[PDB]
Amino acid sequence: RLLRAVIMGAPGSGKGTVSSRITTHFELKHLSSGDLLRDNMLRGTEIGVLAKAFIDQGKLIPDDVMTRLALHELKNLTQYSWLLDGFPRTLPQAEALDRAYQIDTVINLNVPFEVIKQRLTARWIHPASGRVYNIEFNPPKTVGIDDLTGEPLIQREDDKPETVIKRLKAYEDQTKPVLEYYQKKGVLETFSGTETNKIWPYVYAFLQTKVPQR
Ligand SMILES: Nc1ncnc2c1ncn2[C@@H]1O[C@H](COP(=O)(O)OP(=O)(O)OP(=O)(O)O)[C@@H](O)[C@H]1O
Ligand SMILES: [Cl-]
Ligand SMILES: [Cl-]
Ligand SMILES: [Cl-]
Ligand SMILES: [Mg+2]
Ligand SMILES: [Mg+2]
Ligand code: NA
Ligand code: NA
């Protein structure tokens, strides 16, 4: 039985790293909705130009548009094991997917809000030089100050707590119904933790029972 899987996780949860590792260790196709959108935007396809119109304005792709795009990619990939990442993002997407394919495995990375928030708000910049500081991994010698110049660091808008809080609230509003949908269907597997490297072995062992290695 070929894998018919979805992976879910908030921004900053480590889902990107886990999906990357899944793809390197297992013989499957990684189907990232963001990659698919970007391929179409790069090539200027009909759906790519429409997607660009939304993304350039910071808008979600409408459900019907996104589902049409995703199903078209899947339609010629049924000879392969699949790992859907980024789709379904919303309950209408998940219900539309359910009318097209039987999804047998949904992985969720359950990482605490405070942990995610700290990860997503950690980046500070010295604008003139472009030097990057990460409160967790390469902090400045003096809080809030550039090491070479003594000048203030700033946060880019995407990295500020106000923006991050809104982003995580949106993710929760959109995806909590999807998680509950798959929980009810009995296909949800939840991995909880605070460090990607401590979660990955358990995801790895779980998938070892479901799809061949690469
Ligand atoms: N399944 C989807 N439904 C609706 N919009 C989507 C979907 N997947 C991607 N997008 C749009 O494409 C953008 C780029 O996708 P990508 O997965 O790279 O997002 P991202 O930069 O991680 O942002 P996000 O936090 O919104 O996922 C998203 O921000 C979103 O607007
Ligand atoms: Cl992530
Ligand atoms: Cl494959
Ligand atoms: Cl960083
Ligand atoms: Mg994303
Ligand atoms: Mg340093
Ligand atoms: Na990809
Ligand atoms: Na990617």
- Of all protein residues, whose CA lies closest to atom 19 belonging to ligand 1? 34
Compute the chain's Rg from CA coordinates: 19
Indicate if 167 belongs to the active site: yes
Instruction: For a ligand 1 pocket test, name from 7, 15, 17, 37 the mutation site with the most ligand atoms within 8 angstroms of its C-beta.
Output: 37
Four-residue CA torsion sign, 156, 48, 26, 181 = positive
Question: Is the distance from CB of 190 to CB of 108 less than 8 angstroms?
Answer: yes
The coordinates were experimentally obtained by: X-ray
What Å resolution does this PDB entry report? 1.8
User: Which member of 75, 141, 156, 214 is catalytic?
Assistant: 156
Name all contacts of 87-90 with Cβ < 8 Å and 24+ positions apart.
87/6, 87/31, 87/33, 88/6, 88/178, 89/33, 89/60, 89/174, 89/175, 89/178, 90/63, 90/174, 90/175, 90/177, 90/178
| Phi and psi at residue 67, to the nearest 5° | -60, -40
Closest CA to 13 of 87, 93, 85, 82: 85
Pure H helices in the chain: 15-25, 33-43, 46-55, 63-74, 91-98, 113-120, 161-184, 196-208
Binding-site entries for GTP = 12, 14-17, 123, 133-134, 156, 167, 196
Q: Looking at ligand 1, which atom is closest to the CA of residue 37?
A: 12
For CA atoms 155, 51, 75, 106, the dihedral sign is: positive
Q: Could you tell me the sign of the dihedral formed by the alpha carbons of 9, 15, 18, 20, in that order? A: positive
Nearest to 78 by CA among 28, 35, 41: 28
Token pair listed for 149: 């110049």
- Side chain identity at residue 74, one-letter code: L
HSE-up of residue 104 (Cα within 13 Å, Cβ side): 10
Sheet with 82-85: list strands edge to edge: 29-32, 82-85, 4-9, 105-110, 188-192
* Ligand 1 atom nearest residue 85's Cα: 17
Helix (H, G, I), strand (E, B), or coil: what is residue 6?
Answer: strand
